[PDB]
Amino acid sequence: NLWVTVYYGVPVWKDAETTLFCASDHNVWATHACVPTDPNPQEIHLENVTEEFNMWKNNMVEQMHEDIISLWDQSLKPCVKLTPLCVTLQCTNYAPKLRSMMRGEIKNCSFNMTTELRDKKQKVYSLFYRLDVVQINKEYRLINCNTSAITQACPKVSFEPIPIHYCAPAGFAILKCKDKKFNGTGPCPSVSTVQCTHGIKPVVSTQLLLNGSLAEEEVIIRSENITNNAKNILVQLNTPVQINCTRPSNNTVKSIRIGPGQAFYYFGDVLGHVRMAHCNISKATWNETLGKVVKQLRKHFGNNTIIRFAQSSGGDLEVTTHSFNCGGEFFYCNTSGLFNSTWISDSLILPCWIKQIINMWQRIGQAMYAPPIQGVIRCVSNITGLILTRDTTETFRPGGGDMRDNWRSELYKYKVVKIEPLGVAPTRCKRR
Amino acid sequence: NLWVTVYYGVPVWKDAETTLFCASDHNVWATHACVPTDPNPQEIHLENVTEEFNMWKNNMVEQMHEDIISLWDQSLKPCVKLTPLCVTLQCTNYAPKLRSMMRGEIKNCSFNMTTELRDKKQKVYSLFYRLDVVQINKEYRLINCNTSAITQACPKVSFEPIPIHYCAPAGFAILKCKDKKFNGTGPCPSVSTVQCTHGIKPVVSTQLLLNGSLAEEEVIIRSENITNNAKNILVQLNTPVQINCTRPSNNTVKSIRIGPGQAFYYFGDVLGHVRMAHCNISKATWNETLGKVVKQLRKHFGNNTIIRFAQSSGGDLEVTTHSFNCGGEFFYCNTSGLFNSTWISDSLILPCWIKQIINMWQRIGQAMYAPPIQGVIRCVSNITGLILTRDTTETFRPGGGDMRDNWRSELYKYKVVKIEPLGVAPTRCKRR
Amino acid sequence: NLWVTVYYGVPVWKDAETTLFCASDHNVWATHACVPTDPNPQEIHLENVTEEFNMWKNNMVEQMHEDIISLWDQSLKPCVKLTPLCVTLQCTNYAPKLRSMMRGEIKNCSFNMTTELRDKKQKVYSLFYRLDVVQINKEYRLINCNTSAITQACPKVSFEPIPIHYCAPAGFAILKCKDKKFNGTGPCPSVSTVQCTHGIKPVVSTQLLLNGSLAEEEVIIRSENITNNAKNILVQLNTPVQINCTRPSNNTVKSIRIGPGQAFYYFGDVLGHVRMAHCNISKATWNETLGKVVKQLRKHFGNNTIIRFAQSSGGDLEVTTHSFNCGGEFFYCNTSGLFNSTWISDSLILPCWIKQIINMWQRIGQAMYAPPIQGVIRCVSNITGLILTRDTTETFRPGGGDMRDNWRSELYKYKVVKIEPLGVAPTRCKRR
Amino acid sequence: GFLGAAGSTMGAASMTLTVQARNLLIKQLQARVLAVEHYLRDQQLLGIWGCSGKLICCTNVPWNSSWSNRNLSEIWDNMTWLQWDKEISNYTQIIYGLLEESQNQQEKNEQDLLALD
Amino acid sequence: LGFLGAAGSTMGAASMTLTVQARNLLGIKQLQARVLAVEHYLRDQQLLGIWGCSGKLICCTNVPWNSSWSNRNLSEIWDNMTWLQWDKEISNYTQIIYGLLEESQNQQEKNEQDLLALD
Amino acid sequence: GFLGAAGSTMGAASMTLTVQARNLLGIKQLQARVLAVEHYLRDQQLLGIWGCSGKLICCTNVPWNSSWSNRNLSEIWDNMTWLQWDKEISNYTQIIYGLLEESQNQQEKNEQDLLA
Numbered sequence A, B, C: 001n002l003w004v005t006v007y008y009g010v011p012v013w014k015d016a017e018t019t020l021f022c023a024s025d026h027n028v029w030a031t032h033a034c035v036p037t038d039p040n041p042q043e044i045h046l047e048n049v050t051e052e053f054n055m056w057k058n059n060m061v062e063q064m065h066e067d068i069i070s071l072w073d074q075s076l077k078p079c080v081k082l083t084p085l086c087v088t089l090q091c092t093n094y095a096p097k098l099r100s101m102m103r104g105e106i107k108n109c110s111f112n113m114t115t116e117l118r119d120k121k122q123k124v125y126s127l128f129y130r131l132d133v134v135q136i137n138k139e140y141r142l143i144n145c146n147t148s149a150i151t152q153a154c155p156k157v158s159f160e161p162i163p164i165h166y167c168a169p170a171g172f173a174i175l176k177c178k179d180k181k182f183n184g185t186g187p188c189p190s191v192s193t194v195q196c197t198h199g200i201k202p203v204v205s206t207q208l209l210l211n212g213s214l215a216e217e218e219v220i221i222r223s224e225n226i227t228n229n230a231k232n233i234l235v236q237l238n239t240p241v242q243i244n245c246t247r248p249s250n251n252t253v254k255s256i257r258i259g260p261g262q263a264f265y266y267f268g269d270v271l272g273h274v275r276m277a278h279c280n281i282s283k284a285t286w287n288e289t290l291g292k293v294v295k296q297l298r299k300h301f302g303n304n305t306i307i308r309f310a311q312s313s314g315g316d317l318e319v320t321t322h323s324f325n326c327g328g329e330f331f332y333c334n335t336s337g338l339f340n341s342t343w344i345s346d347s348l349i350l351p352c353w354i355k356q357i358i359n360m361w362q363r364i365g366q367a368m369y370a371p372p373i374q375g376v377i378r379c380v381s382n383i384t385g386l387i388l389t390r391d392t393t394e395t396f397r398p399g400g401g402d403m404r405d406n407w408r409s410e411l412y413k414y415k416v417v418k419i420e421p422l423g424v425a426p427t428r429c430k431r432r
Numbered sequence D: 001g002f003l004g005a006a007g008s009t010m011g012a013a014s015m016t017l018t019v020q021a022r023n024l025l026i027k028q029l030q031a032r033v034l035a036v037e038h039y040l041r042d043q044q045l046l047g048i049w050g051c052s053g054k055l056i057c058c059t060n061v062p063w064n065s066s067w068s069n070r071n072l073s074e075i076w077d078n079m080t081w082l083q084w085d086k087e088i089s090n091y092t093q094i095i096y097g098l099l100e101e102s103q104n105q106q107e108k109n110e111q112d113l114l115a116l117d
Numbered sequence E: 001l002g003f004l005g006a007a008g009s010t011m012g013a014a015s016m017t018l019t020v021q022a023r024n025l026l027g028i029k030q031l032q033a034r035v036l037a038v039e040h041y042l043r044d045q046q047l048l049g050i051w052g053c054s055g056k057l058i059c060c061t062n063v064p065w066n067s068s069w070s071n072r073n074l075s076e077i078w079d080n081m082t083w084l085q086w087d088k089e090i091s092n093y094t095q096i097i098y099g100l101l102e103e104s105q106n107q108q109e110k111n112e113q114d115l116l117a118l119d
Numbered sequence F: 001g002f003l004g005a006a007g008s009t010m011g012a013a014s015m016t017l018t019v020q021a022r023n024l025l026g027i028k029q030l031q032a033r034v035l036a037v038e039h040y041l042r043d044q045q046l047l048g049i050w051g052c053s054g055k056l057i058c059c060t061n062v063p064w065n066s067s068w069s070n071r072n073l074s075e076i077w078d079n080m081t082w083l084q085w086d087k088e089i090s091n092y093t094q095i096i097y098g099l100l101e102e103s104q105n106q107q108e109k110n111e112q113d114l115l116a
């Protein structure tokens, strides 16, 4: 009675993992690699369509991670190598007449560096931060000399994040949840289809997520597993918290040449007074934001338990402090002043340290030397989310260091699906 | 009466040379690049199909050769480069009171090596084998110093061979001869089509083929031209001959840093007595196997001739001795005890030398340093074939060194063809 | 009345910028890779077809430029680096009693260079040309030591140009103007279509174009904007002018090892007399050639305008002088004897200098060391065109330095278009 | 809108097949090659089954009443294509084989008809 | 007369050379060029397929010609004009025509199914 | 069974053309995929131009010549395999293709006149 009919172009799809390409409008996240941008992207709303999402199993995050690592290495490859710098340093204190917490943080290191000609050496004095220099027994060496050779970043390549748009190849589509208060997992009834995602900024930080997306209505707490305290908790804020980070000193940069066609940049001197780098967070804004986080966290853990915040318990500086790139400098800030209160049912100042030897992405065996930036650096940014870990009282601490979670906080809304435009259905026909 | 009819999908093919895929069901040979495995490989027997095969012209061997070279270089490349090691060595004998045939083979070799810092040097004592060190006038240098820079193999990458399957891309097919006593050339009436070959272990050796395929019916003697003295004769055995090779000493391996992120591994000391490495071959098994080889060779030279065997006449150690990789160390063994005989119509022990500086694939300009292995080495393998060179009496000697012949042996049964699915034939129709 | 009919295979094309690929019959250029040799080229004349050309916007010039640079760098890359040579030199004059123009041009330098073993150094004496050595305060260094690293070219790789054919991918076609007196822009009414261009030799020169194409009818003067004096003028000659260049001294080349598996080649000695390199141009032929150029320039600038010629105004030697590669040697020649003249309504000898450190295509940061050639160098070339820069009266000077101008001189006759084999037209039909 | 009809009923969705069909065509190269291969695999399947360059093709394979035995109007009017595709996923490999057999038989019969004259 | 030999010929005469063009249409940059050539070839075949013109070089549809699309009589178009001139003249209406073609083919297939459905 | 009919007569093998039709469709894999696609499309293009785009067995209007290894239909279809037949008429392959293209082009023009 009924016959088989084949329909081509059927609007169905299946979950799939594929290769996405980039689009954008020197920089590490160069726009020369790809420019297939779209000034007028379209969004086709899918009515009466409910799809399941799982931000913790989303291959887009891993693919982005690899893309960032690859772009990073491509940027660093064509740059000056600093292997001649791994020498014994004769270091003394830069300014003994200091009574602030800055005293002892920067040192006067004297060393014999290679000249353009291989026959002669030059005696060079340079100023280094103590976090980059380790005592061996005066007699200091750079912290990276045992673990890895260090490469100098090219002075002409910016570290400023530029939004990157991910686009699916033909035959695939990206589903955007577009659903207020979605927790990153489970069904989403307001799914829309796009070919390209919005731009994502590859902002690198720990503990606090900067320059990200805000929650549509209220703070959203996302976790792979609430009960399992080994998972990180990603908290998306409803409003931004403005943070003003400054290095209030006028630094003078000097350079020397090491071998033919190479130049080394180093921190030369400080004009005027030497002052400590720091970040300013408004006290009331933070207190209100934290209270909102506590209320949402109590919804998961119960109205009758106490939520306590504490400073990171230990480990690498990249995970015990807040970390960010400001002006090209790498700042490490002590956040113990924020996560120091207990919740029961003016301006805050964070001191910061500057270091030039950065071991990014937790890759042991590679290191970058960040050249100093001339002048005074100030950044103003929005704190958009937190990365928290959990220990009748629940204790939470800042954490991070696994960069994938910073991207999950932005890619949770997107899923990649493959289009399979072949369907079969019964009808009443006999071919001819 | 007759008209042209076009048939698409016709089961015909032409000989072709194309690119084949690798598959495997860390190692030097890639495992992440050769993933399209097949747990249930199929073959389709082609009844009434006879094809002409020519192993000597089989393009699969050259492609396999290139694949092995590329994998080798990719594996070795990202490792420590021992440029600072090419220095003058002050060497004496390791154990002057040793009276074994291993006396004088291991040297003390006190030299000045670099350290993590450019400014400082260290005195290092390490042991080297005589075959790796050449006297210049004490006052010794490494053998590679006047030809190439030597790269240290990464200790984390295993040299154990794994099977690699070769698979045709779509549009191509692999024809397996599947014919008992096939001599490598001419018609094969038992062709069976496969998508992928069986796994081939990329075992590299000279003079004797190890861990290869057996000749199910009898010993098979194959050559490009049995009358030409310049062509190698490959003998595939009917049964394996077990060979037990060992390095009967407990060695201690030490490690020192030579620069940032780089460490040099060397032979530290010997625990217990120093003994000569050796291989054990059963005398009766070898005599039976060789007699079988002689009978089959007589079938090509005549029932009334004498077949004489002799040791290799000369050339580089790699070709004059048997060579193999056991556990990651390279053994060079004197096979004169196996080929010292003449055929007219209790274990045998072969001494072996161990060397760490390898000039593989007969390429001048590159070298690999094989780090030592702690403990005692025992390796058991199957001898599956011989490589013979011909000089009333004929003289044959061991030969080899061209890895292509080793792969010709395993690949003689396979041919790659291209499908040309456009048939034309007369029919009794005219369309309209 | 009329209905739309779809036609596929419509002979319509549109201008396009696409990727082309080389095709040719050890060399710097990868002539062993680009070997899809065309056994016999064909062209199809297009009757009643006029096509507008603009040679100054032709994407093929940019593609050729990138292809030449990439091939050159790939060729140079796998060679010995000369970092150990950037040392202080002790230099004296080679021939203190020489009174020819070569007095002071060749210096005899002594330096301490690295030997095969790191521990030992060797004293090396070698000859350098004055243009390659800069005094620092005797006490000389190589000119590249303060701007770039220098790599030694592999002596086995020849710099002789080989014609390269550029072929379109399927779906694209190359249109050849095939019209006498075509000035590089505007319509061509005699356009023919080819699959590939004729062979173009990658000849590198400044000021005078060598071994190029001739203009069969007359001298052709081509410019982007003849009024604008900031643009170069390319003059294609009607007849060739023969230029005979030589380095008459019989040189001896010596070599030393500088490391593990690396060797350095240097100018060893001079047999016989020290003689300056030079080029001989027939005086009458050159004067006739200029007369033709002057007549065409008067046609563009006015019959009563006096045309004056002058020498290059200054700057880098590579632009100020003529530059060419003969036998692999790099010659720089003074052309002031060719362009010193005026026009109002017996051989010429040009002195040349030899330079071994070459900085091609205006790139700072890379340098090549050209090894010496033993024996005597002689070459005969055809001068086929000039690159002139315009300063009552007009003054013209030789110029160059942007290699795309030479390639444009050969590529102007070709345009690349895309085939768009799909269109519609009215007719009288109703589908049925 | 691409996939705009995805949530519509099967009948309504059948009116926008063109919208999905027209949007099916180092990492960028790898993705382009895979997209092309998927397109060609679908075109090959349509050709082998006896479906030419058409969006809807009717064949000679009867419906097996064991598959989604839920009326005819209920499927086209109450279900979307995603639900239908899920419901008969487990029989897809069977249907395709039957389609191939049918076309081979049809071609054989056509050749006999062509031989008659 | 060969590939693009009819480029200067009138629209009618060039219709008999469509076959030669059909034949010609089909390191890392050579691979990229091959991929692009294939992509363009398949896009053209898909576009023809959507309109219902599969194994055809000349394909007649039921979409009427609008006089607004640079109408200039019929005999002039086929006997005097060449394909380059014609393609330039109606370039600005190409997308409009393509949209109509797609819609017509889909409607025809639905009608065929209904006609086929009748027993 | 891919190529299972390779040793069968052409008649018996004709009924199995579908199995080959199905089977016909880092840098090494990309080159292999691109070349496999190009070969597939060249064969499909030839079937397209000849007017055989949708059939595995396509009957056309070109007559068979006696010079093209005429061996009678009974010998060709019952006593020969496709490999042997392909060998016997290999040298006329290009001749056949040219004739096929010309016929289809004339047929389409004729239909255009018959339609108009």
Ligand SMILES: *[C@@H]1O[C@H](CO)[C@@H](O[C@@H]2O[C@H](CO)[C@@H](O[C@@H]3O[C@H](CO)[C@@H](O)[C@H](O[C@H]4O[C@H](CO)[C@@H](O)[C@H](O)[C@@H]4O)[C@@H]3O)[C@H](O)[C@H]2NC(C)=O)[C@H](O)[C@H]1NC(C)=O
Pocket: A158, A160, A161, A203, A210, A211, A324, A325, A326, A327, A328, A378, A379, A380, A381, A382
């Ligand atoms: C979150 O977003 C904010 C807003 O974008 C961001 O702060 C911004 O950072 C950029 C780059 O650090 C600032 O841009 C600089 O502004 C100064 C002002 O004088 C300029 O001098 C800088 O130019 C120098 O550096 C360039 C680098 O390429 C050189 O090309 C140039 O020649 C100069 O040497 C540069 O334009 C921008 O001003 C701030 N915005 C504010 C409001 O402060 C913040 O950093 C982001 N968060 C994180 C963690 O990055």
Ligand SMILES: *[C@@H]1O[C@H](CO)[C@@H](O[C@@H]2O[C@H](CO)[C@@H](O[C@@H]3O[C@H](CO)[C@@H](O)[C@H](O[C@H]4O[C@H](CO)[C@@H](O)[C@H](O)[C@@H]4O)[C@@H]3O)[C@H](O)[C@H]2NC(C)=O)[C@H](O)[C@H]1NC(C)=O
Pocket: C158, C159, C160, C161, C203, C210, C211, C324, C325, C326, C327, C379, C380, C381, C382
């Ligand atoms: C413009 O075109 C002319 C015409 O070809 C060209 O002159 C030619 O130059 C080449 C290279 O110098 C000459 O070929 C050489 O002849 C000598 C004679 O003994 C040979 O020894 C050379 O062989 C050596 O060099 C080769 C370089 O590739 C090596 O491969 C080889 O192994 C040897 O080392 C070489 O064969 C050729 O004879 C002349 N032609 C004429 C007619 O004289 C001129 O150079 C071109 N213009 C420019 C700027 O290049």
Ligand SMILES: *[C@@H]1O[C@H](CO)[C@@H](O[C@@H]2O[C@H](CO)[C@@H](O)[C@H](O)[C@H]2NC(C)=O)[C@H](O)[C@H]1NC(C)=O
Pocket: A225, A226, A227, A228
């Ligand atoms: C979320 O994490 C909790 C952690 O407690 C998981 O529950 C535990 O599962 C382990 C499995 O061996 C048991 O031994 C524990 O006793 C369980 N504890 C509790 C409190 O249930 C839970 O299964 C996880 N859920 C998911 C979806 O991952």
Ligand SMILES: *[C@@H]1O[C@H](CO)[C@@H](O[C@@H]2O[C@H](CO)[C@@H](O)[C@H](O)[C@H]2NC(C)=O)[C@H](O)[C@H]1NC(C)=O
Pocket: B092, B108, B109, B110, B125, B268, B269
């Ligand atoms: C290498 O040679 C030296 C002397 O030529 C050997 O002598 C001493 O060995 C002890 C072992 O504990 C070392 O502590 C001494 O430092 C060695 N002497 C010197 C001068 O350093 C040494 O043992 C030899 N190496 C080995 C492995 O036996």
Ligand SMILES: *[C@@H]1O[C@H](CO)[C@@H](O[C@@H]2O[C@H](CO)[C@@H](O)[C@H](O)[C@H]2NC(C)=O)[C@H](O)[C@H]1NC(C)=O
Pocket: B224, B225, B226, B227, B228, B229
């Ligand atoms: C196999 O090798 C033999 C030996 O070289 C070849 O025969 C020789 O051919 C050369 C050709 O110049 C003659 O000079 C020799 O006298 C020949 N010797 C003998 C014994 O015939 C023979 O042609 C080769 N055959 C193949 C198939 O390679």
Ligand SMILES: *[C@@H]1O[C@H](CO)[C@@H](O[C@@H]2O[C@H](CO)[C@@H](O)[C@H](O)[C@H]2NC(C)=O)[C@H](O)[C@H]1NC(C)=O
Pocket: B244, B245, B246, B278, B279, B280, B347, B349
């Ligand atoms: C090869 O055979 C020899 C005997 O001919 C073996 O030598 C004996 O090895 C055992 C340990 O396996 C010792 O206990 C004996 O003392 C050795 N004999 C002598 C005379 O020293 C040798 O080990 C065999 N090697 C292999 C790899 O099988």
Ligand SMILES: *[C@@H]1O[C@H](CO)[C@@H](O)[C@H](O)[C@H]1NC(C)=O
Pocket: A088, A090, A110, A111, A112, A123
């Ligand atoms: C530089 O080398 C000389 C060598 O005599 C040494 O005395 C001096 O201390 C070195 N400089 C430094 C900063 O160590």
Ligand SMILES: *[C@@H]1O[C@H](CO)[C@@H](O)[C@H](O)[C@H]1NC(C)=O
Pocket: A183, A184, A185, A186, A221, A222, A223, A224, A225, A226
């Ligand atoms: C998200 O909501 C779903 C709704 O059932 C729930 O199952 C899941 O556990 C929630 N996840 C989080 C992290 O709140």
Ligand SMILES: *[C@@H]1O[C@H](CO)[C@@H](O)[C@H](O)[C@H]1NC(C)=O
Pocket: A211, A240, A380, A381, A382
């Ligand atoms: C912080 O968020 C607000 C929200 O509108 C935005 O306007 C502002 O520019 C953000 N700040 C930065 C530094 O991006």
Ligand SMILES: *[C@@H]1O[C@H](CO)[C@@H](O)[C@H](O)[C@H]1NC(C)=O
Pocket: B211, B240, B380, B381, B382
């Ligand atoms: C030697 O060959 C036999 C053949 O059956 C096999 O079982 C055995 O494992 C082989 N030995 C090795 C070491 O592979």
Ligand SMILES: *[C@@H]1O[C@H](CO)[C@@H](O)[C@H](O)[C@H]1NC(C)=O
Pocket: C088, C089, C090, C110, C111, C112
């Ligand atoms: C080489 O080194 C020695 C070291 O004393 C020095 O005297 C000599 O002048 C050096 N040679 C040159 C050419 O500078």
Ligand SMILES: *[C@@H]1O[C@H](CO)[C@@H](O)[C@H](O)[C@H]1NC(C)=O
Pocket: C224, C225, C226, C227, C228
């Ligand atoms: C040529 O250059 C002159 C310079 O004055 C300018 O006025 C003129 O417009 C230019 N013409 C073109 C075609 O570039």
Ligand SMILES: *[C@@H]1O[C@H](CO)[C@@H](O)[C@H](O)[C@H]1NC(C)=O
Pocket: C211, C240, C380, C381, C382
């Ligand atoms: C110079 O041009 C003439 C023109 O016919 C040609 O015959 C001659 O070979 C050319 N010379 C060189 C060196 O190419």
Ligand SMILES: *[C@@H]1O[C@H](CO)[C@@H](O)[C@H](O)[C@H]1NC(C)=O
Pocket: A046, A047, A048, D004, D005, D006, D007, D008, D009, D012
């Ligand atoms: C969703 O369901 C409603 C029910 O009335 C229907 O009107 C609407 O068209 C459906 N959505 C789509 C895309 O068809």
Ligand SMILES: *[C@@H]1O[C@H](CO)[C@@H](O)[C@H](O)[C@H]1NC(C)=O
Pocket: D063, D064, D065, D066
């Ligand atoms: C459906 O197909 C299966 C195949 O196993 C068969 O057993 C069953 O009888 C079929 N049902 C109908 C109604 O044709």
Ligand SMILES: *[C@@H]1O[C@H](CO)[C@@H](O)[C@H](O)[C@H]1NC(C)=O
Pocket: C047, C048, E005, E006, E008, E009, E010
């Ligand atoms: C060019 O125009 C003339 C005018 O009569 C015509 O005869 C000729 O055939 C045209 N060219 C082509 C290729 O049709």
